[PDB]
Each structure stands twice: as structure tokens, then as C-alpha cells.
Amino acid sequence: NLSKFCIDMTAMAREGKIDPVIGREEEIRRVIRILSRRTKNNPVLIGEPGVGKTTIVEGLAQRIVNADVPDNLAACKLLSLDVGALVAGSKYRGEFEERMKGVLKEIQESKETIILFVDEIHLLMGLKPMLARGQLHCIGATTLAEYRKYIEKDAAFERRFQQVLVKEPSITETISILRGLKEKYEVHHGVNIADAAIVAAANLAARYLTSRRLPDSAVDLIDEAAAAVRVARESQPEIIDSLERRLRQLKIEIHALSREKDEASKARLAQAKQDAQNVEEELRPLREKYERERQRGKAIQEAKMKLEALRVKAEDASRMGDHSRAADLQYYAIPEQEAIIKRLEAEKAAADSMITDVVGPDQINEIVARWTGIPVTRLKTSEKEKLLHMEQALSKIVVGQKEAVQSVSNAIRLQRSGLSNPNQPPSFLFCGPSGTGKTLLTKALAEFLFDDPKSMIRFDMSEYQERHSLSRMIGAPPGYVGHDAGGQLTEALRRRPFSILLFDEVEKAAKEVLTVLLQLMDDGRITDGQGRVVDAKNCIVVMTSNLGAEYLSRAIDPTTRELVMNTLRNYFLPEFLNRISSIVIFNRLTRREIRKIVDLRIAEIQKRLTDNDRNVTIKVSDEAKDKLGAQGYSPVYGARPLQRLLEKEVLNRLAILILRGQIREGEVACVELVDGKVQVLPNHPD
Amino acid sequence: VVGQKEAVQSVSNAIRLQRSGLSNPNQPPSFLFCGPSGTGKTLLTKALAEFLFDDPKSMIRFDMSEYQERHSLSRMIGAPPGYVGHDAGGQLTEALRRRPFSILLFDEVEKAAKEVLTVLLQLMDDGRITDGQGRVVDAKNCIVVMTSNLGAEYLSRAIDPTTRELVMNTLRNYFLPEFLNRISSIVIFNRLTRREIRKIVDLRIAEIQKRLTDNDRNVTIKVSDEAKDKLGAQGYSPVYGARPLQRLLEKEVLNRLAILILRGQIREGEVACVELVDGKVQVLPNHPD
Ligand SMILES: Nc1ncnc2c1ncn2[C@@H]1O[C@H](COP(=O)(O)OP(=O)(O)O)[C@@H](O)[C@H]1O
Ligand SMILES: Nc1ncnc2c1ncn2[C@@H]1O[C@H](COP(=O)(O)OP(=O)(O)O)[C@@H](O)[C@H]1O
Ligand SMILES: Nc1ncnc2c1ncn2[C@@H]1O[C@H](COP(=O)(O)OP(=O)(O)O)[C@@H](O)[C@H]1O
């Protein structure tokens, strides 16, 4: 029998082997409704990895055994085909075909009405279960991209399925899932889980673990924290460790001192016995309280496990009409058990760091820090603290755009405090000359909000200038130009919801593409090429332009404000400009502002020198710093030429002199203005 | 929409005339909104969209500032094969095919090229238009709203009936009499009074109050009378009407109200009192830092 490749999900439901399903009621109704059709009655779940496609099928198994299904599905055996163990457990040989025909024909013959679930069904499309006589009912699962690239390219097979879009849960929806799962993961690892950790896991998974989708990214995070405390609780506390070792040390010293015959040894041998006794007097109360209390936390955890097992037997008794055994458990066994837990737990808090058996926000922040590589100190700081000094944090990166930094900071504060439309993402149009900070501010925002430059995604509107390019942005219907690649924007929103979308040189976008941005800015959601609406409530929109550099001379001025804004009113329609949260204007950088930018860059070069072994300190004379700022600025490219200019004039020679030994450890690399050209001079002749 | 009772009654009566079957079934309801900027012309059209179709997307906006020259007509209806914008089609004709039950808003209609106006008259008179390739597209089930401000000169803050034909004679030279005659209702917006401007302020804090309630926060915004007065005085403009009001509240009240909330100086269950201190609107903390 080819039960080697399938697991009975309906069986697992009767045995309490399926963790609870939270929410997702409308999706399970859709699956039931599709299955009950006679038309195309095979649902295919379409969603990103980890959004909960499988647990939807698991909920259906729970509904089949609980009679919460229509009659046509009540006596169904819902089987899950292990396609992973099928294609990987096989080679090019004819065993893939032979193995699947075997299972497909065991389904054929036996007389249970059987619904086959195949997760990652695209792996079966590179095979032919055309048993659509009404022999088998199938539930498929895959991602949207793989549905497009592998399932959508065999229409005849596809048309017998009906899409069910499974969107990613909100953070709020995610904690409801984690809260509902809380007790299962408590009893499983034998530890306790605080609610603030659950809120921490959901909020942090969405913000920093952008590589995996909710709620899986939050589930994996709590599960790893719990496993990290499963070993902490089975280890002696730190103070019992330290005490026990000094005690063993003093016992060594006592045996040794008792051998030496002299006046000073005997006076401290007696002191060593006392020090040993003092340690033992501090250690015995503690070591006793620890074991006393780890033995009870373990007695509680099995008390919880027999309770759960009783409820499985009780649910199955009442399901099978055995009222005799169902009365045993529901009225006597289970409340006798529940009374044992109530008493053992009540004394637990009453007994009363030590015995770490709790998943707290610290354990979540530490687990994430190891995975994400961000220092734990940066994850403990409250969002409210950062946002209150946001202008401070950005101004360390962006010079001379105080009016811009204030606008970005105020808009973000408006949304975490709940005063902005919750269906509209913050939207920005940066306007001003090249090399003034428009892109840089957006990078600083990315690293401030998500502590990662990757959190921003860049779209260059120079590549979306014609009406033909819209399919590149959102995708295309089947059989069209770029149906399979999808859209750049739509695919970015599905896989990186908490992102900053930078649209560079937005003035060049085709009017059809601008229309998509207005939908993004107004409704917080867009429609892809196939009518599907993808969500975007949790992104940030930054658009950059330079249509105002004509009226900005190096000097911010308020009369110049509407000459650039009237230049904007003809390129963009008034409804476009009205739906932008803040139209922000960058002015040209002054000579002093250009000079601090130079100090910023030497500070970074100074950091790499310090980050490596070298104790070389870069100091810049005033007039040399002045020539760098004069050679660096350009009325056309702003501060862009500055990074390369320093490299060419200062850094090239500074390298050579370091490796030549003409600037040694502990000395200063003095960069001067000699004969009107910036140079850095040696400190020792060759 | 505050302070445009004569306008709301006109829109309401015209719609009632057509669901009850007393208006021409081949003519869509057509409106020309006339009056100063920021008086409610666009807003009333949005409210109509959300009232009739419970969706702001049910309206489609055409800015006549982008149809000022005779060349622009092909943008409106399309072009014969091989011409300028044959493939993009027309904005109006493509909108009517794909969104028949729509509200078509033509903003600043006074600036449309006379050829484009001709298309609107066909839309208003026959309920159908001809695209660039002679094809006739149907439009029996749409609504036409046109906005203008050619009458703001003769409307001081006070609606008055002698002022009615000074704005309507200003309309008679920009638009031909057959154009004006085929419009279901020529509706005039007057300037908003000081009390009307004040309820608009209460409307906007009510929306900010809703988002606060819609999120977790039990912070209640109350506005003193004189602070509410300064907001309405700083907000109104004889040129931009009530447009500066939304940003003014954001700049003076909402920016600080955010900071104080995240600082904990206005906590759950308390009131954000917005006052007039030293002649400038501010919202004060309830607890020192
Ligand atoms: N509605 C839900 N209720 C409880 N747990 C859920 C829910 N949705 C997802 N999960 C959890 O998320 C994790 C991965 O979900 P899963 O259904 O395997 O995602 P997918 O199958 O879409 O890759 C599982 O550990 C599961 O327990
Ligand atoms: N205001 C500024 N503060 C600091 N550096 C700046 C500033 N403006 C420009 N730069 C430098 O110039 C480079 C490019 O600037 P950027 O902001 O990308 O120009 P744009 O305004 O065209 O987006 C950045 O890497 C940065 O080093
Ligand atoms: N009568 C009014 N009632 C309420 N709000 C108004 C009124 N008039 C103007 N506003 C405010 O001003 C903004 C712009 O008004 P709008 O009606 O677009 O001006 P216009 O008359 O130029 O179309 C609206 O978003 C609205 O908040």
C-alpha cells in the first residue's frame, strides 16, 4: 500500500495532532464552497511561503471531523501527498511516474471519498491526474509566481481549479495567531511564553525578518526562543554555578593546607573551612529552592500534557457517540486533572535572576539579533524614543536640508501616533537639484526605520517612459509580454511589504505609470496586470525630481516656493499633487554645508582606518578643506563629485604613503593645499 | 458639504427627477458648478460619488487645463489609424466604455478648447459621443459635472439673487447659449461665511478624532472657541477658499499633538486641549516631560 507518501490529515485531526487554526474563516468557506461545486471543484491556494496555506487545509480537516461541513464532505478522508519525499526521493528514472501512478490508483480503488491535498503543486508540473471524472478531489497550494510560471502554462489542467488568494496577515492578525497558539507551544517545549514576547515577535518579524512572511516568521521566532529557554531552564543558574565552584576550590585548598606545618597556614586553613561553610550556607538554600521549583514546573507541564490527552479522548468519545467514556473524562478525569494544575500553579507563583523558564521580550530581541546581526542594544530602544529625536538621527547623515528632515520626521510621527489615514502610506515628493540629498535622505530613512539599506527598493522612472512599460511595473494578463516576470512593483509589495519604494526622476514616468502611483498614494493598494489587487498599507513612497533646480540659487526662501511648485503643477495633475503627504523642496548646498559634507566623508575614511589595524589619523587644513569643497561642488551635479575627488587627490596618495611607511602608526596624515592643489604629505622620507 | 444648501438641493432634485422617470432618458444629468475656489465644487462631486456608488473611484477626473488647444481633442476621444494617439485612444471614450456608471468631472471647463466643449455638448445633449474613428460610444448612464470659477468676482461673503445674472452673464460669453441651455442645472457656489468656515474645522477634527478612535488611542480632541476662531480666520482665503485649512491644522495642531502623544504628555483617556496661547494656536501638554 502506497501509504508511504501520504498522511491522513482527517485522522490527525481526531488525534489532536493539528495545532489550532485562528481566523481564516472566509478562506475555509471558499474552499468548502469550491469543493461542493460540480463545475470546477478543486481549490488551489495561492500565497507567499508561510502565510498559512497549509493550516487552512488543516482547518478543513478539523471541520470534516466536527461535522461542520456540508453532507457531501462529511465522510471524506483528506490526504496530504508528500510531494517533497516523492520528487526528491527519486531520480530521472521512471520512479517518479511509477510512484505517483501507484498513489493515484490507490485513491482510485478504495471506496472512501478522498480529497487529495498537494502542497507545492507546481513541483508536479515539472504528472497527469486527469481523474476528473469525479474520482478525486484535489486541493493545491503554490505561490503566485510559480502558479504563473508553471501552473498557468497548462490551461486545460488549470481551468479545473479555482484560485483562492491567501493574503499575508496583518501584525494585529499575527498576534491573534500567536496568542491562539500560545498554550500549544507552552506545553510542547515545557516553558512559559509572555504576551509581550508575542507582541515583540510579531512586530519585529515584520520589521526586521523581511525574508520570510508572517506569521511563519513570528512563529519560527517564538519557537526558537522557547527552545533557547528549554535548555536554560535545564541548566543551573549562574550563581549556583559560581558558588559550587568556589566551594570545590576551597575543599581543594583545605586538603592542601592541612599538610603544611607552619603558623600562617593553620590560621588560614581554619579560615578556609569557614569560607567553605559560608559558601555552603548560601548555596544549600538556593540549590534546594531551584530543584524544589524545577521539579514542580515539570510536574505542571506533564499535568498539562495529560489534561490535553484527556481532552482528545473526550472529544473523540463525544464524536463517536460513546457517552459512557465521554462522561468519565468530561465530568471526572478532566476536572480532577484541571484541579491538579490549578493547585500546582497557584503554589508556583506563591513560592517565589533564577530558574529562567519564560520567553520574554529580551529572549525575542536576542534571538533576532543573532539572526539579523543587529546589536541587541538597537532593538531594545522603543520606537517612540527614536521618533522623538528623528531629526537628530537623520541630520547626522543629511546636511543642509533641515526643512526636508523636519517634513519626513513629522509625517512619520503622524502615522505612528495614529493621526494619519491608516489606509494611505506616507508619500513624499523630493524636489531639488541633483546631489543635494534627495536619494541620501531616503537611504538614511531606510537605515533609521529598518536598520538596513536593503529595506528600500529603487525604481528608475527613466525605464518606464512609454505606455508599453506598465506591464513591467505591474505584470500582464496570461499570454502577454511579461506575464511570468510579473511586475516590479507588485512583486516587490508581496515579498517586501515593509519597504521604502523610491521612484527616481518621477517626472519622466509615463502617465499610465503615474496613475499607478496615485492609486498607491490614495488607496494604499494597487491592481496588478491580471486585475488582482495587491496590498500596500505598510510601505513608504518616496519620489524624487529635479524640476525646481532652475529657481534655486545658493542661499530656505519662501517666494521661490511656488515657482518650483508651479513648475510641478503642469507636469503633474493637481489630484496627483494633492494626494502626496508632503511636497518637500531641497535647496542648493552652501559653501559651509559643502565643507561639513567633506568632514563627514573623512570621518568615514577615518572609521575604516580605525576599523582596520591602522592608527593613522587624518587631519585636514582649513584651506585644503576649502579647495576640496570648491572643487567638489557643481551647480549641475551637486555634491556627487565629492566622493571621487577625495579618492583621487587624497586617498590614492594616502594609500601609497601608508604602505611605503612614510606615514606610520600613531602619526597624522596631514592633507594640505600645496601650490594650489590638495595633497597629503609624508612624515618620513623614503 | 457646508454652506452650499442651494447647490445640494439642485443636485438632489436633478437626481430625483431621473430615478422617478421625469427627465429625458437619453440625456445624462449635467451640472456646471460655478463659484470661488475652495467652496465645495469638487467636494460635492466626491460626496455625490460616495453617496451614489459608495466609492470615490466611481468619479473620473478630467482637468481641462490639459485640453486647451485644438490639438488636444484626440487625447479626449482618440484618433483615426496612423495618427497621433490612435492606440492610447481617448481619455473620455475609453472611460465611458469601461466605467459606464461613472461621474465625469471636468475641472475648470472655461479653459477647454471650443472643439472639446463641442464634445461635452454632444455628451450633454444626445447621451452619446463619437470617438476619433467615427465610432459612437454610449453614455446614457453617466453623470456630468463641470466646475468653473468665472463668478467669484461678484460674490462677496454673505445666497443673493441680484448677483445671479452678473455671474451668469459672465458665463454667456465664455459659453454659447446652446451650451448653457443643454445643462440640467447651472449651480452657483457663494463664499463661505465665518460660521460656515468654523463647522468645516469641526468636521476635520471629527475626522482626526475618528482615526484616533480607529487606532488604539483614547485621546479626545477639544478645541476652545477662540482657538477655533483663529483656525477659521487663518484658514479662509478670498483666493483659495477653505483649501488651506487641512494643512493649517496639520502644521499648528497635528504636528505637536503627535509629539506629545508619543512623549506621553497626553495619555490615554485624557483630552488634547487645543488653545490660543499668545495669539497662536497650540495644543498643550497634560503632564511635564
Ligand atoms: N491561521 C493560523 N492559525 C494558527 N497558526 C497558523 C495560522 N496560519 C499560519 N500558522 C502557522 O504558521 C506556520 C506556517 O504556516 P503554513 O500554513 O505552513 O504556511 P504555508 O503552508 O502557506 O507555507 C505554521 O507553523 C502554522 O502553525
Ligand atoms: N545634503 C547632503 N548631505 C550629505 N551628503 C550629500 C548631501 N547631498 C549630496 N550628498 C552626497 O552626494 C551623493 C549623492 O547625493 P544624492 O542625495 O543621491 O543626490 P540627489 O539629490 O540627486 O538624490 C551622496 O552619496 C552624498 O554622499
Ligand atoms: N463647503 C465646504 N464644506 C466642507 N469643506 C469644504 C467646503 N469647501 C471647501 N472645503 C474643503 O476644501 C477642500 C477643497 O475644496 P474643493 O471643493 O475642492 O474646492 P473647489 O470649489 O475649488 O472645487 C476640500 O477638501 C474640503 O476639505
Short mmCIF file of N, CA and C in Angstrom, two decimals, chain A residues 420-506:
data_model
loop_
_atom_site.label_atom_id
_atom_site.label_comp_id
_atom_site.label_asym_id
_atom_site.label_seq_id
_atom_site.Cartn_x
_atom_site.Cartn_y
_atom_site.Cartn_z
N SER A 420 -2.71 59.99 10.98
CA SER A 420 -2.82 59.97 9.53
C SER A 420 -3.71 58.81 9.10
N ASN A 421 -4.26 58.94 7.90
CA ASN A 421 -5.11 57.92 7.31
C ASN A 421 -4.42 56.55 7.38
N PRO A 422 -5.04 55.55 8.01
CA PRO A 422 -4.40 54.23 8.10
C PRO A 422 -4.46 53.43 6.81
N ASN A 423 -5.18 53.91 5.80
CA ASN A 423 -5.25 53.26 4.50
C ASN A 423 -4.35 53.94 3.47
N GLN A 424 -3.63 54.99 3.85
CA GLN A 424 -2.73 55.69 2.95
C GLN A 424 -1.31 55.59 3.49
N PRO A 425 -0.36 55.07 2.72
CA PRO A 425 1.02 55.07 3.16
C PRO A 425 1.59 56.48 3.07
N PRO A 426 2.54 56.83 3.93
CA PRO A 426 3.22 58.13 3.79
C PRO A 426 3.85 58.24 2.41
N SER A 427 3.65 59.38 1.77
CA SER A 427 4.14 59.60 0.42
C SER A 427 4.92 60.90 0.37
N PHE A 428 6.03 60.90 -0.36
CA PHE A 428 6.89 62.07 -0.43
C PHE A 428 7.32 62.32 -1.87
N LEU A 429 7.35 63.59 -2.24
CA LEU A 429 7.96 64.03 -3.48
C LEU A 429 9.14 64.92 -3.11
N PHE A 430 10.36 64.41 -3.29
CA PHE A 430 11.56 65.22 -3.08
C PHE A 430 11.86 66.00 -4.35
N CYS A 431 11.99 67.31 -4.21
CA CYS A 431 12.21 68.21 -5.34
C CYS A 431 13.43 69.06 -5.06
N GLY A 432 14.35 69.13 -6.02
CA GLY A 432 15.54 69.92 -5.86
C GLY A 432 16.69 69.45 -6.73
N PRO A 433 17.77 70.23 -6.75
CA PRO A 433 18.89 69.95 -7.66
C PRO A 433 19.57 68.62 -7.35
N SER A 434 20.24 68.08 -8.37
CA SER A 434 20.99 66.84 -8.20
C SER A 434 22.05 67.00 -7.12
N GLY A 435 22.34 65.90 -6.43
CA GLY A 435 23.40 65.89 -5.44
C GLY A 435 23.14 66.79 -4.26
N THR A 436 21.87 66.99 -3.89
CA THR A 436 21.54 67.80 -2.72
C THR A 436 21.09 66.97 -1.53
N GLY A 437 20.79 65.69 -1.72
CA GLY A 437 20.46 64.82 -0.60
C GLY A 437 19.18 64.03 -0.74
N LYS A 438 18.50 64.15 -1.88
CA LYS A 438 17.20 63.51 -2.06
C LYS A 438 17.29 62.00 -1.90
N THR A 439 18.16 61.36 -2.68
CA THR A 439 18.36 59.92 -2.52
C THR A 439 18.98 59.59 -1.17
N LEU A 440 19.91 60.42 -0.70
CA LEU A 440 20.61 60.10 0.54
C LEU A 440 19.66 60.11 1.73
N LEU A 441 18.79 61.12 1.81
CA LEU A 441 17.77 61.16 2.86
C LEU A 441 16.92 59.89 2.86
N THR A 442 16.58 59.39 1.67
CA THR A 442 15.78 58.17 1.60
C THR A 442 16.55 56.97 2.13
N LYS A 443 17.86 56.91 1.83
CA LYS A 443 18.70 55.86 2.42
C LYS A 443 18.77 56.00 3.94
N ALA A 444 18.93 57.23 4.43
CA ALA A 444 19.00 57.43 5.88
C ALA A 444 17.69 57.04 6.54
N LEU A 445 16.57 57.33 5.88
CA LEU A 445 15.27 56.89 6.37
C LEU A 445 15.20 55.37 6.44
N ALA A 446 15.66 54.69 5.39
CA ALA A 446 15.67 53.23 5.40
C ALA A 446 16.49 52.69 6.56
N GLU A 447 17.71 53.19 6.74
CA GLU A 447 18.56 52.69 7.82
C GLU A 447 18.08 53.14 9.20
N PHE A 448 17.32 54.23 9.28
CA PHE A 448 16.76 54.62 10.56
C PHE A 448 15.54 53.79 10.93
N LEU A 449 14.66 53.51 9.97
CA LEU A 449 13.42 52.82 10.29
C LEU A 449 13.61 51.31 10.37
N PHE A 450 14.46 50.75 9.51
CA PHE A 450 14.63 49.31 9.43
C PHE A 450 16.07 48.86 9.62
N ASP A 451 16.99 49.77 9.93
CA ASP A 451 18.38 49.44 10.21
C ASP A 451 18.96 48.52 9.13
N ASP A 452 18.70 48.87 7.87
CA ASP A 452 19.10 48.05 6.73
C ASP A 452 18.89 48.82 5.43
N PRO A 453 19.95 49.07 4.66
CA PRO A 453 19.77 49.71 3.35
C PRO A 453 18.91 48.90 2.39
N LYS A 454 18.86 47.58 2.56
CA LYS A 454 18.05 46.73 1.70
C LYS A 454 16.55 46.98 1.87
N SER A 455 16.14 47.63 2.95
CA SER A 455 14.73 47.90 3.17
C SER A 455 14.14 48.86 2.14
N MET A 456 14.97 49.54 1.36
CA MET A 456 14.49 50.37 0.27
C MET A 456 14.64 49.64 -1.05
N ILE A 457 13.69 49.88 -1.96
CA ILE A 457 13.69 49.28 -3.28
C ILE A 457 13.58 50.40 -4.30
N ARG A 458 14.48 50.39 -5.29
CA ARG A 458 14.65 51.54 -6.17
C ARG A 458 14.04 51.25 -7.53
N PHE A 459 13.20 52.17 -7.99
CA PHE A 459 12.63 52.13 -9.32
C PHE A 459 13.10 53.37 -10.06
N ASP A 460 13.77 53.18 -11.19
CA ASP A 460 14.23 54.29 -12.00
C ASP A 460 13.19 54.55 -13.08
N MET A 461 12.51 55.69 -12.98
CA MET A 461 11.45 56.02 -13.92
C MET A 461 11.97 56.29 -15.32
N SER A 462 13.28 56.46 -15.49
CA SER A 462 13.85 56.54 -16.83
C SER A 462 13.63 55.26 -17.63
N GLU A 463 13.29 54.15 -16.96
CA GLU A 463 12.97 52.89 -17.61
C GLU A 463 11.47 52.61 -17.67
N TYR A 464 10.64 53.62 -17.42
CA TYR A 464 9.19 53.48 -17.52
C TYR A 464 8.60 54.68 -18.24
N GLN A 465 9.24 55.11 -19.34
CA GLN A 465 8.85 56.35 -20.00
C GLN A 465 7.72 56.17 -21.01
N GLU A 466 7.48 54.96 -21.51
CA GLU A 466 6.48 54.73 -22.53
C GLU A 466 5.32 53.90 -21.97
N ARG A 467 4.15 54.06 -22.60
CA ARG A 467 2.95 53.34 -22.14
C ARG A 467 3.16 51.83 -22.14
N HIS A 468 4.05 51.34 -23.01
CA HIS A 468 4.33 49.91 -23.08
C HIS A 468 4.93 49.38 -21.78
N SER A 469 5.58 50.24 -21.00
CA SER A 469 6.35 49.80 -19.84
C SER A 469 5.50 49.47 -18.63
N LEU A 470 4.19 49.72 -18.67
CA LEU A 470 3.37 49.50 -17.48
C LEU A 470 3.36 48.03 -17.07
N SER A 471 3.36 47.12 -18.04
CA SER A 471 3.39 45.70 -17.73
C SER A 471 4.66 45.32 -16.98
N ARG A 472 5.76 46.03 -17.22
CA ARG A 472 6.95 45.85 -16.40
C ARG A 472 6.69 46.24 -14.95
N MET A 473 5.83 47.24 -14.74
CA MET A 473 5.57 47.73 -13.39
C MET A 473 4.62 46.82 -12.61
N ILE A 474 3.57 46.31 -13.24
CA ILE A 474 2.52 45.59 -12.52
C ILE A 474 2.27 44.18 -13.03
N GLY A 475 2.87 43.78 -14.15
CA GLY A 475 2.57 42.48 -14.72
C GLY A 475 1.62 42.58 -15.89
N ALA A 476 1.22 41.42 -16.39
CA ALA A 476 0.42 41.35 -17.61
C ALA A 476 -0.51 40.15 -17.53
N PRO A 477 -1.64 40.19 -18.25
CA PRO A 477 -2.54 39.02 -18.27
C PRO A 477 -1.88 37.86 -18.98
N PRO A 478 -2.42 36.64 -18.83
CA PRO A 478 -1.73 35.46 -19.38
C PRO A 478 -1.54 35.56 -20.89
N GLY A 479 -0.37 35.14 -21.35
CA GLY A 479 -0.04 35.14 -22.75
C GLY A 479 0.52 36.44 -23.28
N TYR A 480 0.76 37.43 -22.43
CA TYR A 480 1.21 38.74 -22.88
C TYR A 480 2.71 38.89 -22.72
N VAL A 481 3.17 40.13 -22.62
CA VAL A 481 4.59 40.42 -22.82
C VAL A 481 5.42 39.85 -21.67
N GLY A 482 5.18 40.34 -20.45
CA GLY A 482 5.95 39.89 -19.29
C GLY A 482 5.05 39.33 -18.22
N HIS A 483 4.22 38.37 -18.61
CA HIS A 483 3.26 37.79 -17.68
C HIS A 483 3.96 37.05 -16.55
N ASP A 484 5.06 36.37 -16.87
CA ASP A 484 5.73 35.48 -15.92
C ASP A 484 6.70 36.21 -15.00
N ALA A 485 7.45 37.18 -15.53
CA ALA A 485 8.28 38.00 -14.65
C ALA A 485 7.43 38.78 -13.66
N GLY A 486 6.17 39.02 -13.99
CA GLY A 486 5.32 39.83 -13.15
C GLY A 486 5.72 41.29 -13.25
N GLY A 487 5.15 42.08 -12.35
CA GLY A 487 5.53 43.47 -12.22
C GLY A 487 6.63 43.66 -11.20
N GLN A 488 7.45 44.69 -11.42
CA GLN A 488 8.49 45.00 -10.45
C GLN A 488 7.88 45.54 -9.16
N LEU A 489 6.88 46.42 -9.28
CA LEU A 489 6.24 47.00 -8.10
C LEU A 489 5.37 45.98 -7.38
N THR A 490 4.52 45.27 -8.13
CA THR A 490 3.61 44.32 -7.49
C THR A 490 4.37 43.18 -6.82
N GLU A 491 5.41 42.67 -7.48
CA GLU A 491 6.19 41.61 -6.86
C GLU A 491 6.97 42.13 -5.65
N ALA A 492 7.39 43.39 -5.67
CA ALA A 492 8.07 43.96 -4.51
C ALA A 492 7.13 44.09 -3.32
N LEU A 493 5.87 44.47 -3.57
CA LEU A 493 4.94 44.67 -2.46
C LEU A 493 4.54 43.35 -1.81
N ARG A 494 4.46 42.26 -2.58
CA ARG A 494 4.08 40.98 -2.00
C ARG A 494 5.19 40.43 -1.11
N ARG A 495 6.44 40.56 -1.53
CA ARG A 495 7.55 39.92 -0.85
C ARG A 495 8.28 40.82 0.14
N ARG A 496 8.08 42.14 0.07
CA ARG A 496 8.73 43.08 0.98
C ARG A 496 7.74 44.18 1.35
N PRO A 497 6.69 43.83 2.10
CA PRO A 497 5.65 44.83 2.41
C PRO A 497 6.16 46.06 3.15
N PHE A 498 7.07 45.88 4.12
CA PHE A 498 7.52 46.98 4.97
C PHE A 498 8.77 47.61 4.36
N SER A 499 8.56 48.22 3.20
CA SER A 499 9.65 48.70 2.37
C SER A 499 9.49 50.19 2.10
N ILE A 500 10.58 50.79 1.64
CA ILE A 500 10.56 52.13 1.10
C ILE A 500 10.70 52.01 -0.40
N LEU A 501 9.73 52.55 -1.13
CA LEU A 501 9.72 52.50 -2.58
C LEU A 501 10.22 53.85 -3.07
N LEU A 502 11.39 53.85 -3.70
CA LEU A 502 11.98 55.06 -4.24
C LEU A 502 11.76 55.09 -5.75
N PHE A 503 11.04 56.10 -6.21
CA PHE A 503 10.82 56.31 -7.63
C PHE A 503 11.67 57.51 -8.04
N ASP A 504 12.77 57.24 -8.72
CA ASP A 504 13.74 58.26 -9.07
C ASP A 504 13.35 58.93 -10.38
N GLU A 505 13.42 60.26 -10.41
CA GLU A 505 13.07 61.07 -11.58
C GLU A 505 11.64 60.78 -12.03
N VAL A 506 10.70 60.99 -11.10
CA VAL A 506 9.30 60.65 -11.34
C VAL A 506 8.69 61.47 -12.46
#
